[model samples]
Target: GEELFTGVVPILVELDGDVNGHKFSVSGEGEGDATYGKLTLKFICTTGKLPVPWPTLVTTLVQCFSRYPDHMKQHDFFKSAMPEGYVQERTISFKDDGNYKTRAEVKFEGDTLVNRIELKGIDFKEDGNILGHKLEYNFNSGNVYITADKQKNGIKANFKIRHNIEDGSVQLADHYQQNTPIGDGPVLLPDNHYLSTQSALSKDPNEKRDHMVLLEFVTAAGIT
Candidate 1:
């Protein structure tokens, strides 16, 4: 049999000298099944000027966990629960433009553990736009790992995207190219784009495209 667990906490961050900030918390509960355990987390953001909006909040949270390797290592709950040498991969597809689509993949390899993160897979909307883009990452152990030996380290990834667009008359253009660094942590990327964070609390005030990511620590008891 399985049971449900829930928790809540108030987060306080000080900027300069003011203690004024918003309260943030998370609650989760799920059941164990024959195959795997089903778990869901809910995050409440009550900040004054959150970089990302509310509706895409969940997406932002998911991306945050995916991008930051240090945050993942710090959380004992996930480190202990996940199998050692375990590998997990995730793929996300989004619209690049009117006539092009894009996809990205992040892979975690328990072995070697050096290049823990690898990205590949980019598709075009049109039939013959382009093959797709692939990028590999090799992180500097000292830069990413909090410790000297570098048991756990963060990774930096670079990517390039190519797309072909068509006019109303069905004419095809050569192909547009874009290369950029995903970014580190909650830092926002150039051109008003966010690294992770997704979900919008309100459609009017915030747009679906606006998103960001967050990283934090958690305990074995499921407390943060």
Candidate 2:
């Protein structure tokens, strides 16, 4: 017999003093069977210290990392940096549109911003698959700008990609690919990530050497 189960999912975001005082939290509910379920996610921005004005940056990073699922135990960064109040709970439900809800919250402690997140009302289908998931991310932070010294202003930026699932893992790629370029891509000045570098100009009789900012994205996981 295919019985419907109902449960709640909670997601939270915690931050230490390192990268600004940022925190997030949210919770909600849903219904489904055993194989598949529908999840609705809502995000909150409590800390008022966003690195950028636009919330897209943070959201994009989260989305990217989530898609590339990696064990937290293996990744030292995640192991040490993940918020303390993080949990992953699964539930099932029968109703197609019940009172399943999700919400998010954020707060700042001293120099660190904390994010408390919770997801509720998630329904899993009998096939053990999720039906639908929605994410609502919000932000509230002061505008802060980073200025570079004139001498270390210019920077070169380029994009690259790597194939082969083996070469895609962070461990293998760290040593093999380092900052290698995937292929020919557009180069821009004043790399976003790095702000210190000299400008390169191509003169008629002089060869110009440009500083590089290698941006690589590995396609180890199947493209969605």
Candidate 3:
């Protein structure tokens, strides 16, 4: 039989960037958390190139584990001798457009890992709709990762959330409405540190009023 472990990562995902070289950013931070379930490790960006897309940036960074496979496997948090193929072979990856359709892969030794740790549920729903527009969201998929950092002499873990959002009114206005790209992240931070990223805009370049999305994570956690 399989087992399940649950936890939550508290964070802050704030938007502060621009679209089409225009000044765009959120006024306040979106306070929320990334909730997840796992059979493996526990849970856990940047600006550039105009509307870099938050989901893609954060998803890419979490691959930090890939760079330290040996370090990860040696960690006390690393589950040992997992059943063959018992470790999930794929994690989630987001597209630059905020649309992701595949689960990424992580391998160690001869077994695939990562998929075992999955996101149960997550949200910044508390932020409510933006500028009077209802936000529609999709919980695609998520995964957790843990790695060892010798340079920093500390254990690192993160939760990757793969989710997308659409503006109800904008879609009705035209096919060019803003669809916030899917993004996700969580860190076993000390309630003071945070993670952040740049994301696509909410309006088309033609709108002139268009603005990109930025997300920041603070007070990340894993209450398991």
Candidate 4:
């Protein structure tokens, strides 16, 4: 009972003049099957001078000066998201201090997120201790979103993961994501991955067939 779809309208439009000094706007016209990148930002300015117009102000700001792998060591959720034995890096020219002051390099493969970011207010990595932090993440596709609010040296952080309602397997997430049935005893379709609605005999009024014939068909299709 769910459906989703999409089409692209490449945005990359900027005005040389606008209200509140709003200058350049961005939309993707990059490498892909078609022009297909989208970014959105919403500002809630109630009682402060929100800095909303800086064409050179890169959106990403690394509030914490600790940096990536070193930053990841500060937050437990990041550590959990980053598995052991997986390659780690100290720092790269990648994020360019999490924001580009001027010209910068933003590549895909090697420059992707090497670790998570810490909050802007405090340096949680003074002595490598974040025991008093709230954090959550999933390792190996589990649910329950491993959480931590414990205390060690007085710091704080948090995050979460996703699972399913029944047994909490991420596989269930993928299973139902494709319009598949839930808990309905998987009656597989031809694709071998999709779950049928498990309804026996079509609701179509014309094909006069008995339940036994459908039952045999279900059996033959290994739906039992």
lDDT digits (tens) for residues 126-224 of candidate 3 = 233322223342222333343443343333444545344463332111001011111121212122222222222232345332233323222112221
Q: State the displacement of the C-alpha of residue 28, model 4, in Å, after optimal TM-score superposition.
A: 13
lDDT (tens digit, per residue) of candidate 4 on 164-206: 2123432111110011111222221221211111112112245
Please name the candidate that would achieve the greatest lDDT relative to the true structure. Answer: 3
What are the runs in model 2 whose C-alpha is more than 4 Å off? 1-8, 17-40, 54-224
Query: Comparing 1 and 3 by lDDT, which wins?
Result: 3
Error of 4 at 168 (Å): 55
Clashing pairs in 4: 12-27, 131-151, 131-152, 134-157
Per-model root-mean-square deviation over C-alphas: 17.6, 24.8, 16.8, 25.5
TM-score of each predicted structure versus truth: 0.19, 0.19, 0.24, 0.15
Output the worst ten-in-a-row residue range by lDDT, candidate 3.
172-181
How many clashes (backbone atoms < 3 Å, residues ≥3 apart in a chain or on different chains) does model 1 have?
16
Clashes of 4: 4
Candidate 3: global Cα-lDDT? 0.25
